[PDB]
Amino acid sequence: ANPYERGPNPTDALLEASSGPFSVSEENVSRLSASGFGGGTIYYPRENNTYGAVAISPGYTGTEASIAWLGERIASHGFVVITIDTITTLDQPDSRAEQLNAALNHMINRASSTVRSRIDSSRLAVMGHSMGGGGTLRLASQRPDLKAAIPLTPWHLNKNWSSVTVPTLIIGADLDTIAPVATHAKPFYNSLPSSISKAYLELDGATHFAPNIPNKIIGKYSVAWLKRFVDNDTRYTQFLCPGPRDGLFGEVEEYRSTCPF
Ligand SMILES: [Cl-]
Ligand SMILES: [Cl-]
């Protein structure tokens, strides 16, 4: 049996809820004590166990407030999650990649024993919004030991991510005029190797700012992806394969994947 399984057997309704089954506490990280990034908040499950750890970046002009809901929701499904502030809010994707890496290292090495005792440092993931999603792709290309990557409405001038080996879920937004899916999210997904576990989920009726507002579909599929790949939790394959409905009258605009994985 899988030693990394946490929490009850999942259902659609459990993943769509505003909170998962774990109570969550928070640890503040000050800007100055955050070596290589701008501080942030660590959310963790109160139940003592070891969990995978996730670092999440905002985008250009964004602060951790724009991603806080998602950090707390993911932590409530059984993850230690840091939502970061960047060194400046105008940092570019490849800078955000370095800061995500710094934040992972902070959680493992420099956070309190309350946080560190709950982290399985061999099971790490990264996520980010917009330029933070571009930073997610860059770090995933640089760190094949990561267990999952989730770029949310990502922006990056580099379209070629054929070097990425990490299981990657790209979430695009159909109405996005800031990082249009035709020039960012879809080219990124298409350049990822066909031989990795990957998926593309395009939200219906959503703008670039959809990740900054509590969103049932972003929360559901982020958690399912992290469960399946950070925890190797095959109880969550059912949500990814075949995935959300995308036909006429569907849950999303489009879903693609390399299932069965
Ligand atoms: Cl949506
Ligand atoms: Cl929603």
From Swiss-Prot:
Thermal dependence of function as given in the entry:
Optimum temperature is 25-50 degrees Celsius. Optimum temperature is 55 degrees Celsius. Optimum temperature is 60 degrees Celsius. Optimum temperature is 65 degrees Celsius.
Assigned EC number: 3.1.1.74, 3.1.1.101
Provide the Gene Ontology terms for cellular component.
Answer: extracellular region; periplasmic space
- Listed as disulfide-bonded, the cysteine pairs are C241-C259
Ordered alphabetically, the record's keywords are: Disulfide bond, Hydrolase, Periplasm, Secreted, Serine esterase, Signal
Q: Which residues constitute the catalytic centre?
A: S130, D176, H208
Q: How is its activity regulated?
A: Activated by magnesium ions. Activated by calcium ions. Inhibited by the serine hydrolase inhibitor phenylmethanesulfonyl fluoride (PMSF).
InterPro entries referenced in this protein's UniProt entry, alphabetically:
AB_hydrolase_fold, FrsA_esterase, PET_hydrolase/cutinase-like
Question: What is the recorded phenotype of mutating D174R?
Answer: Increases the thermal stability of the enzyme
Cite the effect that the entry attributes to H129A: Decreases activity on poly(ethylene terephthalate) (PET)
> How can this protein be applied?
Has potential for application in biological recycling of plastic waste products. Shows promising applications in the laundry industry as a cleansing agent, as it is thermostable and tolerant to surfactants and organic solvents. Also shows promising applications in ethyl alcohol distillery processes as it may be utilized for treatment of molasses wastewater.
Q: At the top level of its lineage, which domain of life is listed?
A: Bacteria
With respect to pH, the record says: Optimum pH is 8. Optimum pH is 6.0-6.5. Optimum pH is 7.5.
> Is Secreted given among the entry's keywords?
yes
Compartment(s) of residence: Secreted; Periplasm
Q: Indicate the family of this protein.
A: Belongs to the AB hydrolase superfamily.
Q: How does it assemble?
A: Monomer.
What does the UniProt record say this protein does?
Catalyzes the hydrolysis of cutin, a polyester that forms the structure of plant cuticle. Shows esterase activity towards p-nitrophenol-linked aliphatic esters (pNP-aliphatic esters). Also hydrolyzes the triglycerides triacetin, tributyrin, tricaprin, and trilaurin, with a preference for short-chain substrates. Hydrolyzes the hemicellulose xylan. Capable of degrading the plastic poly(ethylene terephthalate) (PET), the most abundant polyester plastic in the world. Can also depolymerize poly(epsilon-caprolactone) (PCL), a synthetic aliphatic biodegradable polyester.
What is the protein named?
Answer: Cutinase cut2
Encoded by which gene? cut2
